[PDB]
């Protein structure tokens, strides 16, 4: 068990990628705060995962909620050792149709949410004096722009950048900051994602997803489970010398 | 010469780099909107440059000011062919001292200001149906993070991403979107920049600036004139096949 | 006349892109050594271009030919101010079919040829004490690997790398070293290239070429003329502060 | 545990980084071929490591030696599952002093050695039908050039490129190709590396090594043990969806 006795918090972990990370972390001996805007779903998730997972209501766009979430983790587990910034929102629209609402919402959650949660965790970790681990969720989208995905790509580029900056600033406190960049990951969101491409590219529903899946060198779209090995690795002692990096786990969909 | 008959608008061009760009564009035969929030200096600059330059009041953080600026180029110049997003703000603080005010202010101007001005320009260019040129100002800060400069770095990373996405979306309208990434450029702003570094790096005043200058492979910090050639090139016919690129003009300070 | 009074040498300029550069340089006032293994065609080209162009026999794989070529520009033009390393060979094969012959031949021309010509030009430029410009030809292939193009991609990656190293080492002598990276350029060679892809991807003849052209965001494969502006720019005073860069001119085919 | 029953071959594994990888692999349950040009050193390393390690004489510059080594692996273990291309040579010299001997020797070992060993391993893995893992050793040097290290940097850039190309071509055979890029790693070679820098930079002995060590954000130069976690990870099932990536493990010395 590579994370034995560790205290983690994962934002947006009631469902999806964050939820898989939560389960993997518990398997590896960690206690995990299931942080989510949906307290009901967080409580269900925590009960399904087991005794070591516990629900925390959190809105990463609000400072008071961020601070309350950190304090609940300290209260419940005695401190905080691992942060995963997984909360994210996707959207899509061509340049001439980008709205200020899309820009503000996606930046508030994907960039500000990650930045200020990272900062609150950093402060707690510094106060503890024991290190150690922060993992941001980037994306292939942050590696290169895309015609219909300007806002989301830009938030993920910002995340990769913040990962580098925070990494350099916090390593003196024995805190590693790194990021994982998935490529295309299958899941409940892809119906809406495909529908959005179908609308703007004028394709039959389902065609975009299929083309995307067929283009991954590996042979298929990713699963959350493809990513858990890396999430454990970057939270363990085996990654202590790894600083300010973004690692693509994407079946070859992007090369860095 | 190279920009004969072209209508341009440059944000933040009352002073510094933007003004040097405006003066260079006029020498190359363009008509130029000196768009700045400092309308008094924009007017003095427009008056000094000559009849081909005219002052436009603009605050890239306000949608109505953005739309009014584009309307102004239509009124004065009959339309818009070249947009340079030059307006920007700098700040510096370690992760644990980053404020929401700093985040919101730098993103509103550096990211939202660039995105929505680009969008307004693109709409006008598409309506004209004669293609166009858009040049965003990035920075070495956009290429890699820095311990003390998380916010500014992230905004410039977002600009590089947006440059990429917009370039891919808009090329079918014959609009080139690219960016210039300067390195370190000398100017009065370095008193404050040095002071901020001196404080957090525990150095005597002037030392940071000195060291930064000495470390540029070319052998000196940049001037506006180092950048003017590239600004003309990316607005000229010689750059027609150039799409979604960021070009470093930085004395070798960063290699891309 | 941005290259007035300058002396240049361009490798592999009897035909194609290199010849287009030579013609462009001549129009900008330069004297140009048409250097090529195909001396017959180089002579014909120099005669067609006009009195400022002269043929020079060179095989970039042979040190004695390189040194004699540099000596030729000194003799005919009085010195050497601009070098363009354009000579290159292409090949294609899946990993399990790559031969040592293909490896040796592509590295000798593409990498050794560029490196040691660069070296010989640099020595002459340092001896002159007037600085200089060196432009290497990279490729999109140099920016990212490709299943069937391992050898060529690796040579172009080596070129980008060498451009960076040489740029850092030579700038103290006022020599700018940079590179241009074209995307896909139409031409006679595409019949063979298409044929090779057709074989390994199991495609009808001409399909690969068609798909490639349609996949370029700009909407067409490149021409030599798309590249001439950048070639002049990087040899001119407008690029003095530009060091160790590789610039993509590729219709958006790769974003750097 | 993590590599139970796997057959590995690591080039240059008698001493240094390869040796550490060999020892870590054996602890994780692998059988390891200790390939080295120095057969007595290989036979000795194998003896010391244990019964799961066996010596193989190999010159990665010779096709026949490469082919013989793979065959011995198939002879001793029942086949080959993991290849680590660790054999490498370093050299240093400014542009004007680079010799053809330095160019040829470093490229033969660092590039050709890696390419043709990877090719022979791939062929054997394809014939087995059970997939496989291949890890190339890159370097921070492959990420960006340096004034005094053009040859070595260029070889490591070529390695990163080959990693991408081979990864894309071989994943259909269920062979993962990835690379590790250490930053600066302490070891017996650094006394000579420092000496080379001291010579050309004209420094007291030891000054370069200290400055380099002090500039790593983490706080010290690397050890081989910093890298073993990643070497195991990329050879294990936890990296199955990881293709064509180069991962920096370098204390923050370079960010990718
Ligand atoms: Na629970
Ligand atoms: Na005026
Ligand atoms: Na002639
Ligand atoms: Na043994």
Coordinates of N, CA and C in Angstrom, one line a residue, chain D residues 85-190:
Chain D
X85 N 17.1 1.1 -23.2 CA 18.2 1.6 -23.9 C 19.0 2.6 -23.1
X86 N 20.0 2.2 -22.3 CA 20.7 3.1 -21.4 C 22.1 3.4 -21.8
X87 N 22.6 2.5 -22.7 CA 24.0 2.8 -23.2 C 24.1 4.2 -23.8
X88 N 25.1 5.0 -23.4 CA 25.2 6.3 -23.9 C 26.6 6.9 -23.6
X89 N 27.1 7.8 -24.4 CA 28.4 8.4 -24.2 C 28.2 10.0 -24.2
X90 N 28.9 10.7 -23.4 CA 28.8 12.1 -23.3 C 30.1 12.7 -23.9
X91 N 30.0 13.9 -24.4 CA 31.1 14.7 -24.8 C 30.7 16.1 -24.9
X92 N 31.7 17.0 -25.0 CA 31.4 18.5 -24.9 C 32.5 19.2 -25.7
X93 N 32.1 20.2 -26.4 CA 33.0 21.1 -27.2 C 32.2 22.2 -27.9
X94 N 32.7 23.4 -27.9 CA 32.0 24.5 -28.6 C 32.0 24.2 -30.1
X95 N 31.0 24.8 -30.8 CA 30.8 24.6 -32.2 C 32.1 24.5 -33.1
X96 N 33.0 25.5 -32.9 CA 34.2 25.5 -33.8 C 35.2 24.4 -33.5
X97 N 35.0 23.7 -32.4 CA 35.9 22.6 -32.0 C 35.3 21.2 -32.1
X98 N 34.1 21.2 -32.5 CA 33.5 19.9 -32.7 C 34.2 19.1 -33.8
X99 N 34.5 17.8 -33.5 CA 35.3 17.0 -34.5 C 34.3 16.0 -35.1
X100 N 34.7 15.5 -36.3 CA 33.9 14.4 -36.9 C 33.9 13.2 -36.0
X101 N 35.0 12.9 -35.3 CA 35.2 11.8 -34.4 C 34.2 11.9 -33.3
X102 N 34.0 13.0 -32.7 CA 33.0 13.2 -31.6 C 31.6 13.0 -32.2
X103 N 31.3 13.6 -33.3 CA 30.0 13.5 -34.0 C 29.7 12.0 -34.2
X104 N 30.6 11.3 -34.9 CA 30.3 9.9 -35.3 C 30.2 9.0 -34.1
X105 N 31.0 9.1 -33.1 CA 31.0 8.2 -32.0 C 29.8 8.4 -31.1
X106 N 29.4 9.6 -30.8 CA 28.2 9.8 -30.0 C 26.9 9.4 -30.8
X107 N 26.8 9.7 -32.1 CA 25.7 9.3 -32.8 C 25.6 7.8 -33.0
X108 N 26.7 7.1 -33.2 CA 26.7 5.7 -33.4 C 26.2 5.0 -32.1
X109 N 26.6 5.5 -30.9 CA 26.2 4.9 -29.7 C 24.9 5.4 -29.2
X110 N 24.7 6.7 -29.1 CA 23.5 7.3 -28.5 C 22.2 7.2 -29.4
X111 N 22.4 7.2 -30.7 CA 21.3 7.2 -31.6 C 21.1 5.9 -32.3
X112 N 22.1 5.5 -33.1 CA 22.1 4.3 -33.8 C 22.0 3.1 -32.9
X113 N 22.8 3.2 -31.8 CA 22.8 2.1 -30.8 C 21.4 1.9 -30.2
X114 N 20.7 3.0 -29.9 CA 19.3 2.9 -29.4 C 18.3 2.4 -30.5
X115 N 18.4 3.0 -31.7 CA 17.5 2.7 -32.8 C 17.6 1.2 -33.1
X116 N 18.8 0.7 -33.4 CA 18.9 -0.7 -33.9 C 18.7 -1.7 -32.8
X117 N 19.0 -1.4 -31.5 CA 18.7 -2.3 -30.4 C 17.1 -2.3 -30.2
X118 N 16.5 -1.2 -30.3 CA 15.0 -1.1 -30.2 C 14.4 -1.9 -31.3
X119 N 15.0 -1.8 -32.5 CA 14.4 -2.5 -33.7 C 14.6 -4.0 -33.5
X120 N 15.7 -4.5 -33.0 CA 15.9 -5.9 -32.8 C 14.9 -6.5 -31.7
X121 N 14.8 -5.7 -30.6 CA 13.8 -6.1 -29.6 C 12.4 -6.1 -30.0
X122 N 12.0 -5.1 -30.8 CA 10.6 -5.0 -31.4 C 10.3 -6.2 -32.2
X123 N 11.2 -6.6 -33.1 CA 11.1 -7.7 -34.0 C 10.9 -9.0 -33.1
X124 N 11.6 -9.2 -32.1 CA 11.5 -10.3 -31.2 C 10.2 -10.3 -30.4
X125 N 9.8 -9.1 -30.0 CA 8.5 -8.9 -29.3 C 7.3 -9.2 -30.2
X126 N 7.4 -8.7 -31.4 CA 6.3 -9.0 -32.4 C 6.2 -10.5 -32.7
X127 N 7.3 -11.2 -32.8 CA 7.3 -12.6 -33.0 C 6.7 -13.4 -31.8
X128 N 6.9 -12.9 -30.6 CA 6.4 -13.5 -29.4 C 4.9 -13.4 -29.3
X129 N 4.3 -12.2 -29.7 CA 2.9 -12.0 -29.7 C 2.3 -11.6 -28.3
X130 N 3.2 -11.2 -27.4 CA 2.8 -10.9 -26.0 C 3.0 -9.5 -25.7
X131 N 3.3 -8.6 -26.7 CA 3.5 -7.2 -26.4 C 4.9 -7.0 -25.8
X132 N 5.1 -5.8 -25.2 CA 6.3 -5.5 -24.5 C 6.5 -4.1 -24.1
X133 N 7.6 -3.8 -23.4 CA 7.9 -2.4 -22.9 C 9.3 -2.0 -23.4
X134 N 9.4 -0.8 -24.0 CA 10.7 -0.3 -24.3 C 10.8 1.1 -23.8
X135 N 12.0 1.3 -23.1 CA 12.2 2.6 -22.5 C 13.6 3.1 -23.0
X136 N 13.6 4.3 -23.6 CA 14.8 4.9 -24.1 C 15.3 5.9 -23.0
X137 N 16.6 6.1 -22.9 CA 17.1 7.1 -22.0 C 17.4 8.4 -22.8
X138 N 16.5 9.4 -22.5 CA 16.8 10.7 -23.0 C 17.6 11.5 -22.0
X139 N 17.3 12.8 -22.0 CA 18.0 13.7 -21.1 C 17.4 15.1 -21.2
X140 N 17.6 15.9 -20.2 CA 17.3 17.4 -20.3 C 18.0 17.9 -21.5
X141 N 19.1 17.4 -21.9 CA 19.9 17.8 -23.0 C 19.1 17.7 -24.3
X142 N 18.2 16.7 -24.4 CA 17.4 16.5 -25.5 C 16.2 17.4 -25.6
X143 N 16.0 18.2 -24.5 CA 14.8 19.1 -24.4 C 15.2 20.5 -25.0
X144 N 16.4 20.8 -25.0 CA 16.9 22.2 -25.4 C 18.4 22.1 -25.6
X145 N 18.9 22.9 -26.5 CA 20.3 22.9 -26.8 C 21.1 23.7 -25.8
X146 N 22.4 23.5 -25.8 CA 23.4 24.3 -25.0 C 24.6 24.6 -25.8
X147 N 25.2 25.8 -25.5 CA 26.3 26.3 -26.3 C 27.5 25.3 -26.4
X148 N 27.8 24.6 -25.4 CA 29.0 23.7 -25.4 C 28.7 22.2 -25.6
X149 N 27.4 21.8 -25.7 CA 27.0 20.4 -25.7 C 26.2 20.1 -27.0
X150 N 26.5 20.6 -28.1 CA 25.7 20.5 -29.3 C 25.5 19.0 -29.7
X151 N 26.6 18.3 -29.7 CA 26.6 16.9 -30.2 C 25.7 16.0 -29.3
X152 N 26.0 16.0 -28.0 CA 25.2 15.2 -27.0 C 23.8 15.7 -27.0
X153 N 23.5 17.0 -27.0 CA 22.1 17.4 -27.0 C 21.4 16.9 -28.3
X154 N 22.1 17.0 -29.4 CA 21.5 16.6 -30.7 C 21.1 15.1 -30.7
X155 N 22.0 14.3 -30.1 CA 21.7 12.8 -30.0 C 20.5 12.6 -29.1
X156 N 20.4 13.3 -28.0 CA 19.3 13.1 -27.1 C 18.0 13.7 -27.6
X157 N 18.0 14.7 -28.5 CA 16.9 15.2 -29.2 C 16.4 14.1 -30.2
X158 N 17.3 13.5 -30.9 CA 17.0 12.4 -31.8 C 16.4 11.2 -31.0
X159 N 16.9 10.9 -29.8 CA 16.3 9.8 -29.0 C 14.8 10.1 -28.7
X160 N 14.5 11.4 -28.2 CA 13.2 11.7 -28.0 C 12.3 11.6 -29.2
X161 N 12.8 12.0 -30.4 CA 12.1 11.9 -31.6 C 11.8 10.4 -32.0
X162 N 12.9 9.6 -31.9 CA 12.8 8.1 -32.2 C 11.7 7.4 -31.2
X163 N 11.8 7.8 -30.0 CA 10.8 7.4 -29.0 C 9.4 7.6 -29.5
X164 N 9.1 8.9 -29.9 CA 7.8 9.2 -30.4 C 7.4 8.4 -31.7
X165 N 8.3 8.3 -32.6 CA 8.1 7.6 -33.9 C 7.9 6.1 -33.6
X166 N 8.7 5.5 -32.9 CA 8.6 4.0 -32.6 C 7.4 3.7 -31.7
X167 N 7.1 4.6 -30.8 CA 5.9 4.5 -30.0 C 4.6 4.4 -30.8
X168 N 4.5 5.2 -31.8 CA 3.4 5.3 -32.7 C 3.3 4.0 -33.6
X169 N 4.4 3.5 -34.1 CA 4.5 2.4 -35.0 C 4.3 1.1 -34.3
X170 N 4.6 1.0 -33.0 CA 4.7 -0.3 -32.3 C 3.6 -0.6 -31.4
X171 N 2.8 0.4 -31.1 CA 1.7 0.3 -30.1 C 0.6 -0.7 -30.7
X172 N 0.5 -0.8 -32.0 CA -0.4 -1.8 -32.6 C 0.0 -3.3 -32.2
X173 N 1.3 -3.4 -31.9 CA 1.8 -4.7 -31.5 C 1.7 -4.9 -29.9
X174 N 1.1 -3.9 -29.3 CA 1.0 -3.8 -27.8 C 2.4 -3.6 -27.2
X175 N 3.3 -2.9 -27.9 CA 4.6 -2.5 -27.3 C 4.5 -1.1 -27.0
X176 N 4.7 -0.7 -25.7 CA 4.8 0.7 -25.3 C 6.2 1.2 -25.5
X177 N 6.4 2.3 -26.2 CA 7.7 2.9 -26.2 C 7.6 4.3 -25.6
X178 N 8.4 4.5 -24.6 CA 8.5 5.7 -23.9 C 10.0 6.0 -23.5
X179 N 10.2 7.2 -22.9 CA 11.6 7.6 -22.6 C 11.6 8.3 -21.2
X180 N 12.7 8.2 -20.5 CA 13.0 9.0 -19.3 C 14.0 10.0 -19.6
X181 N 13.8 11.2 -19.1 CA 14.8 12.3 -19.3 C 15.3 12.8 -17.9
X182 N 16.4 12.3 -17.4 CA 17.0 12.8 -16.2 C 17.5 14.2 -16.4
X183 N 17.7 14.9 -15.3 CA 18.3 16.2 -15.4 C 19.8 16.1 -15.3
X184 N 20.3 16.5 -14.1 CA 21.7 16.2 -13.8 C 21.7 15.2 -12.7
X185 N 22.5 14.1 -13.0 CA 22.6 13.0 -12.1 C 24.0 12.8 -11.7
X186 N 24.2 12.8 -10.3 CA 25.6 12.7 -9.8 C 26.1 11.2 -10.1
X187 N 27.4 11.1 -10.2 CA 28.0 9.8 -10.5 C 29.4 9.9 -10.9
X188 N 30.1 8.8 -11.1 CA 31.5 8.8 -11.4 C 31.9 9.7 -12.6
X189 N 31.0 9.9 -13.5 CA 31.3 10.7 -14.7 C 31.4 12.2 -14.5
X190 N 30.8 12.7 -13.4 CA 30.7 14.1 -13.2 C 32.1 14.8 -13.0

